[PDB]
Design a protein around this ligand. Structure first.
Ligand SMILES: Nc1ncnc2c1ncn2[C@@H]1O[C@H](COP(=O)(O)OP(=O)(O)NP(=O)(O)O)[C@@H](O)[C@H]1O
Ligand SMILES: [Mg+2]
Lengths: 573, 585
């Protein structure tokens, strides 16, 4: 349970809104008990007094107590429900900022180790479960505990041996029953999560392999196997409800025990009084109404296991050590970046020992460099090392006569503008998808770039206030490639890293992209990594890669004039 | 807007397990009698020792009867929860059975229209959203009309003023809930779009955290998360500020009814109020009966409010399950004509229009003929209808026209017997079985070990078995986790080479594979494509000179047809297509 400690410490902010939402739950839940315990005593006192005791009996004080207890019961529940719901959105904002502000330093490496699609859908769900700790767990458990301790203390002024048998019964089922039923259903709850995921994987394999199964005749054989898992899955769901049916029949019996005990024990006297009279009803009506406090306490303890499980997942994910660390110097960004690479590896080395020693290349200021790699032979890691996703274990990168590790992140992100292969379309306006590159750009400049890049089809509908992304319009490949280039032109960094810009594009759009790089990025030291030969003529100093090493180098005409691997590539195969 | 007919669908799905919903409605009536008996025994016991001063030892029968009604009342609560589950389980088991039946006879043509993670949501996470509608909400709606009428009927003979206090609030509660429910409906509609935008904001900034890093916008997206969370908080607090009044209307009238019953009975015991009783002194047991039962009058309404979320997400589940079960889609017809012989088949098409289950035409007019033992190649750009022809040839797609296999049309060919003569390899291989050995033997479970071992030798899968821990019987895992994409595709080749076939359809194998597995797959599949009629879709566009004919299509129509030599130099669409492949390394 020590897992919740980093997240309970997040409650120091908004510790008055959070405490108020619990106090309002106690006051509401005490007024419910007070309303019915005062009504029960008032009815008994009035009947005992009788008509002859109209004037002797002060009935106006209890009649103001029942009116006051009814107002704070109905006003308290409304305000407790507001503050609790308001304050659970304020800690959700803190949880959202806490995880995001802590997942940034380890974004490329340490967070992409998992499957990004499935992991990030669980990070969002787990922050939601951490958001449930206050209102699903802490508030019902704490509110029940001090409602029990106030009715026990309050009833101890009339009788002590009666306040503690009612308080002791309520304190026993507060502390003994929620853990006792969490232990009984732990085995089934584990057997339930296994069978749900087993049916999930058997159904996906059945649906995905429907073409395979139908042709080989096993479509109905694996459907029987799939149905047998559901039958086992449904049996484990009976046992989960057969234990919920028992935890509900026992809370009704325990609350019955505390009323029958109050009737029997309180009729023998309270404060040494031989005939308690109206004091009997004050105890049997407190016991009748005080078990509403314990109503949410069993389900609060069940959810605590989920909150703790979600606390471990977020903790062990956000507590990793970041790969790279940046200094703090605020060196002024310098234009005309002359990138230098010395013995740096280009591709993750294969068990085949592709290249123990890395590649070396000098990109002078203003030079446009293209790197040719074999398709499907490893993956290029030059951009991650240049973007400082991780530190290069071998070799070193010299960014304009200075090592790349001696730049603060503020300066490093300004000397390098990178267009990645996987271009992300943030669910926001077109202005917010472009001001991302340059926050201070004017309204005309963003539209000027879009016309100049060729995304003119994105300016007729609401202008730049068009919702692009999940809730809005999608962008096709090529229509999304020109957005990535649009940001890089807006970012205006001296060094530009292209990562297969013309990949998956038709020859009509692809020829337009290569013109964009040669025209706009005319003096921006382009370093491009591709698997195509369409427009390499305009680039200077083409670098051909084999097995993670440079086998050929030089200008397109210079490299084509001499027979070599580039000549074979140009002709075919 | 669709609530009325979605709920009609929900209420018609409950005909199965109608005895479970009838026992649960009858147990809610019995439970409302034990509540009344409980309050009557307590009221008589309390009056005896408060007014008549009878000792507790002389009240053993009412105490025994009171304990008995508590045990019976806890029994029906246990019984009603188990009966309620059985109601929900049997709809979920019957709806899922007929969702999987419809999703199987539709075949792979419709299944691949949506990702498998979205079908699992429909079958596994949305069908289960309907459980608490039948297990809890439907029984509680019966408890909300049965039990409260019992208290009013039980209190009315004793005192009509107390029963009028409880019955008087019966119309006043829905009146005020509807009065504030339409003030909370415009808040939903004027904040519907913004909350929809703001809900997926965190996951969006969390998926695109790579792009934020490379642009240095990490510290400026913390402020947007703050600004989006502040906006979402205060935008949805306006909705909740009005949604908590509706729940607070019920708490007002249960607070007013308990307070007003106490004041009416308290003042009538002192002589301040003479009305209400039937010309008889108000007894103390009458006041206790109405005071114990006053909170129980509104409890079924309070519990129903906690189960409304169950109805909300059952209708959302019925929103997507009703459309799925009523989509108009037609299946390929299955004539009963068994194929004549287990020999290579002569497939020929007069004029085909292969159509998706929803009626969309995938492949235009097709005019081709593949003689027995002739291996063809389909080439073309993406989206050109190449794979649609292989699915139609398998029976997965309906077609209009003439597509005759060995002289007999495909529409009147028995799918059970036609697919015994059909073996095929697809891209992105699917391995449904458990072990790698039982996955190869899926094609022919009755294969001998010497025939099985030959298939593994021919398919080049025994040369990476030693790398596997358990060898041939290695558990493949979920989505072929243990095997690489190149290694799994070789296992898919193994079960294609197991049974000899009259027609082999290779839908782009060795496309996304690694360099070595592409060589091994093609080599084992190029020597196996020349002993029976094959039909291979490929994008390699190279070393095809040994294939008999090449059919190139764009936009679903065969445009050029001939051998590799006569299309490479013809300068036609194939040469344009071939130039693109050589353009990229
Ligand atoms: N079962 C189906 N149901 C509905 N639409 C389909 C189906 N199969 C294909 N389509 C669509 O109809 C067209 C036919 O495409 P398709 O038959 O897949 O060509 P293709 O050659 O297989 N594409 P590719 O595999 O990338 O070369 C495309 O626009 C598909 O999106
Ligand atoms: Mg295809």
């Amino acid at each position: 349970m020590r897992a919740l400690l980093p997240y309970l410490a997040l409650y120091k902010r908004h510790k008055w809104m959070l405490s108020l939402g619990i106090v309002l739950a106690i006051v509401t839940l005490l007024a419910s008990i007070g309303l019915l315990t005062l009504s029960g005593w008032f009815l008994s006192a009035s009947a005992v007094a009788g008509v002859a005791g109209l004037y002797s009996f002060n009935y106006m004080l209890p009649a103001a107590g029942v009116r006051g207890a009814a107002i704070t019961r109905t006003a308290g529940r409304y305000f407790e429900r507001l503050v609790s719901a308001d304050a659970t959105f304020r800690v959700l904002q803190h949880l959202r900022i806490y995880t995001f502000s802590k997942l940034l330093p380890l974004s490329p490496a340490g967070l992409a180790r998992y499957r990004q699609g499935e992991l990030l859908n669980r990070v969002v769900a787990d922050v939601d479960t951490l958001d449930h700790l206050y209102l699903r767990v802490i508030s019902p458990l704490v509110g029940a505990f001090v409602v029990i301790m106030v009715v026990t203390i309050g009833l101890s002024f009339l009788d002590f041996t009666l306040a503690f048998t009612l308080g002791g019964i309520m304190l026993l089922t507060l502390f003994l029953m929620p853990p006792l039923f969490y232990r009984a259903g732990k085995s089934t709850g584990q057997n339930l999560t296994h069978l749900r995921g087993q049916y999930r994987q058997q159904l996906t394999a059945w649906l995905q392999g429907q073409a395979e199964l139908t042709i080989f005749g096993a479509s109905d054989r694996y459907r029987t196997q799939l149905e047998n898992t559901e039958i086992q899955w449904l049996e484990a769901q009976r046992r989960q409800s057969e234990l919920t049916a028992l935890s509900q029949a026992i809370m009704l019996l325990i609350g019955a025990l505390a009323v029958i005990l109050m009737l029997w024990m309180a009729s023998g006297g309270v404060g040494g009084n031989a005939q308690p009279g109206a004091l009997i009803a004050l105890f049997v009506f407190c016991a009748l109404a005080a078990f509403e406090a314990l109503a949410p306490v069993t389900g609060a303890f069940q959810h605590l296991g989920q909150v703790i499980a979600s606390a471990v997942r977020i903790s062990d994910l956000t507590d990793q050590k970041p790969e790279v660390t940046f200094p703090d110097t605020q060196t002024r960004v310098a234009d005309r970046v002359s990138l230098t690479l010395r013995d740096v590896q280009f591709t993750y080395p294969e068990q085949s020992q592709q290249a123990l020693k890395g590649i070396s290349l000098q990109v002078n200021a203003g030079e446009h460099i293209a790197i040719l790699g074999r398709t499907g032979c490893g993956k290029s890691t030059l951009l991650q090392q240049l973007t400082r996703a991780w530190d290069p274990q071998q070799g070193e990168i010299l960014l304009n006569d200075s090592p790349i590790a001696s730049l603060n992140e503020a300066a490093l992100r300004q000397t390098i503008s990178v267009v990645p292969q996987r271009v992300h379309l943030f669910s926001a306006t077109l202005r917010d998808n472009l001001l991302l590159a340059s926050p201070g750009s004017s309204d005309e400049a963003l539209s000027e770039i879009l016309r100049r890049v060729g995304l003119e089809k994105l300016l007729e509908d609401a202008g730049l206030n068009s919702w692009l992304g999940e809730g809005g319009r999608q962008l096709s490949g090529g229509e999304l490639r020109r957005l990535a280039i649009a940001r890089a032109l807006l970012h205006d960094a001296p060094l530009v890293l292209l990562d297969e810009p013309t990949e998956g594009l038709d020859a009509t759009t692809e020829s337009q992209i290569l013109e964009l790089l040669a025209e706009m990025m005319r003096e921006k030291t382009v370093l491009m990594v591709t698997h195509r030969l369409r427009g390499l003529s305009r680039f200077q100093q083409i670098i051909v890669m084999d097995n993670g090493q440079i086998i050929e180098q030089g200008t397109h005409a210079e490299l084509l004039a001499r027979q070599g691997r580039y000549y074979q590539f140009k002709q075919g195969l | 807007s669709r609530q009325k007919e979605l709920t009609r669908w929900l209420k018609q799905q409950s005909v199965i397990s109608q005895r479970w919903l009838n026992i649960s409605r009858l147990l809610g009536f019995v439970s409302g009698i034990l509540i009344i008996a409980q309050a009557w025994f307590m009221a008589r016991i309390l009056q005896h020792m408060i007014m008549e001063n009878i000792p507790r030892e002389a009240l053993l029968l009412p105490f025994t009867l009171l304990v008995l009604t508590f045990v019976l009342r806890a029994w029906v609560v246990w019984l009603r929860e188990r009966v309620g589950y059985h109601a929900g389980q049997h709809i979920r088991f019957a709806i899922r059975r007929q969702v999987l039946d419809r999703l199987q006879q539709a075949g792979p043509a419709w299944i691949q229209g949506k990702p498998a993670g979205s079908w699992a949501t429909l079958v596994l996470e949305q069908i289960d959203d309907m459980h608490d509608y039948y297990a809890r909400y439907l029984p509680q709606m019966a408890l909300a009309v049965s039990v409260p009428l019992l208290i009013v009927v039980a209190i009315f003979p004793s005192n009509w003023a107390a029963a009028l206090i409880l019955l008087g609030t019966a119309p006043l509660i829905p009146l005020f809930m509807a009065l504030v429910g339409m003030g909370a409906a415009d808040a939903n509609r004027r904040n519907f779009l913004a909350l929809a935008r703001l809900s997926g904001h965190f996951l969006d900034r969390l998926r695109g955290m790579e792009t934020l890093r490379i642009f240095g916008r990490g510290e400026a997206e913390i402020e947007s998360i703050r600004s989006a969370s502040e906006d979402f908080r205060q935008r949805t607090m306006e909705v909740l500020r009005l949604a908590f009044l509706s729940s607070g209307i019920l708490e007002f009238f249960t607070s007013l009814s308990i307070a007003l019953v106490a004041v009416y009975f308290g003042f009538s015991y002192l002589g301040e109020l003479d009305f209400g009783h039937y010309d008889t002194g108000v007894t103390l047991a009458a006041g206790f009966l109405a005071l114990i039962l006053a909170p129980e009058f509104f409890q079924p309404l309070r519990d129903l409010g906690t189960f409304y979320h169950a109805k909300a997400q059952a209708v959302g589940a019925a929103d997507s399950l009703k459309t799925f079960m009523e989509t108009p889609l037609a299946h390929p017809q299955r004539g009963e004509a068994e194929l004549a012989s287990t020999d290579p088949v002569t497939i020929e098409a007069e004029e085909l229009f292969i159509t998706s289950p929803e009626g969309k035409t995938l492949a235009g007019p097709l005019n081709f003929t593949l003689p027995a033992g002739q291996r063809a190649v389909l080439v073309g750009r993406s989206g050109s209808g190449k794979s649609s022809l292989l699915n139609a040839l398998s029976g997965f797609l309906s077609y209009q026209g003439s597509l005759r296999i060995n002289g007999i049309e495909l529409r009147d060919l028995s799918p059970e017997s036609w697919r015994k003569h059909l073996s095929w390899v697809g891209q992105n291989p699917q391995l449904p079985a458990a072990t790698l050995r039982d996955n190869v033997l899926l094609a022919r479970p009755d294969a001998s070990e010497q025939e099985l071992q030959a298939a593994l030798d021919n398919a080049w899968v025994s040369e990476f078995l030693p790398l596997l821990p358990q060898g041939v019987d290695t558990p493949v895992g979920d989505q072929a986790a243990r095997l690489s994409v190149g290694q799994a595709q070789r296992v898919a080749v193994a079960r294609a080479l197991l049974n000899p076939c009259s027609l082999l359809l290779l839908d782009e194998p060795a496309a996304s594979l690694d360099a070595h597995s592409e060589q091994r797959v093609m080599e084992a599949l190029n020597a196996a494509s020349l002993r029976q009629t094959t039909l291979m879709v490929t994008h390699q566009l190279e070393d095809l000179a040994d294939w008999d004919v090449i059919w190139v299509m764009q936009d679903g129509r065969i445009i050029e047809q001939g051998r590799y030599a006569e299309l490479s130099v013809a300068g036609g669409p194939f040469a344009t297509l071939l130039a693109h492949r050589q353009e990229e390394i």
